[PDB]
Amino acid sequence: SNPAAIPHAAEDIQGDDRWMSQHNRFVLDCKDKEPDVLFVGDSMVQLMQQYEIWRELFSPLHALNFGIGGDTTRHVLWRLKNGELENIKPKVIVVWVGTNNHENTAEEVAGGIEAIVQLINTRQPQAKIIVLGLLPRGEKPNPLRQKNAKVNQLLKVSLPKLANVQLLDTDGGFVHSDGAISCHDMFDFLHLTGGGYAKICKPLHELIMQLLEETPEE
Template sequence: HHHHLAQTKEREPDVVLIGDSLIHHLQLRPIWNELFEPLHCLNFGISGDCTQHVLWRIQNGELDNIEPKVVVLLVGTNNYGSSPEEIADGIREIVIAIRQHLPNAYIVVIELLPRGQYPNPLRDRNKSVNNLLKHKLAGLEKVETVSAEKGLIQADGTISHHDMPDFLHLSDIGYRKAFEPLYDLLTQLLYEHEKEKDLTPSE
């Protein structure tokens, strides 16, 4: 967290990604340097974080001193013992906190990834969270959800260890499948932001 605070004083990111290990490990993968680094991204992932930890970080200065155009959020899969409703509410609370700090930023919520080699209760729970999010975030301005499960679940319902070696974290190939849709959305949002800026008369 303190390392992140230091970075906010040094860097001027266009995009901030905040969340758990799935965000944290992204910066260690080839796709980070190839796709995300050129978009001026800052990575605020912390392994093991739950929704309440991310909320605490935002309330304690992590988005102060910076004005990113887009904030990306992925958190919730580590909230063991929480119901889908509680997790979705926790995510919504984070979105509201981000909005209070950054009134003009786009907020992109990555839906929870599937987990486990075979269909299982935790995977069902994550799916329920994603369904609830669509309702809970509907009507919030400049907030979008993006799915990251495309190509991860095979026709027979299993997940390949090539994509998720431990059926929770992503491999290089898994990151490509899961995060390319996010990259496409980010390039679109940054383009729209530039267009809006061009249309706004300068003072």
């Protein structure tokens, strides 16, 4: 039984109960909104909303964003299991989680995502799922650039089984020849800049648009 795929709510250790605050906000959003597209995941998903490119691309798509920073597969699971998947019937769901899963081997992580996907197409059989691949990180090459890469590998293999899922492993030129990531692309070598997301979002939007143009009687 793989730890990365056991649902688990993040205990607030700080005092301001912010994690639950956000989750509730979403549940509440699930009660009376009705999106075509749903983004779930971690900071990568959360931060995307903050940039000009979100109101430019996905806002008009009737998109919801259920991202929380620093969330792991375990957290996203729990969130999805505890009511972020009720009442809504999105046409497309975008999942983007994993890069915060230190403490798990690549393999376990892939399992996590896979479990997430499983849950999704259980509660939302109609939804077509995109899983964004894990992005490189760190200024210069390292163990984690490697980890994320494996995850992508295993996903390319294990996602074309399992219904209505594809992996979109974007690669904008985030690593150059000398193997360095420019802080013009990742301001802290992890989270993307406006510029960065534009490299990710262009193709993502392009894909969703495809998937939406596929079937429209909901």
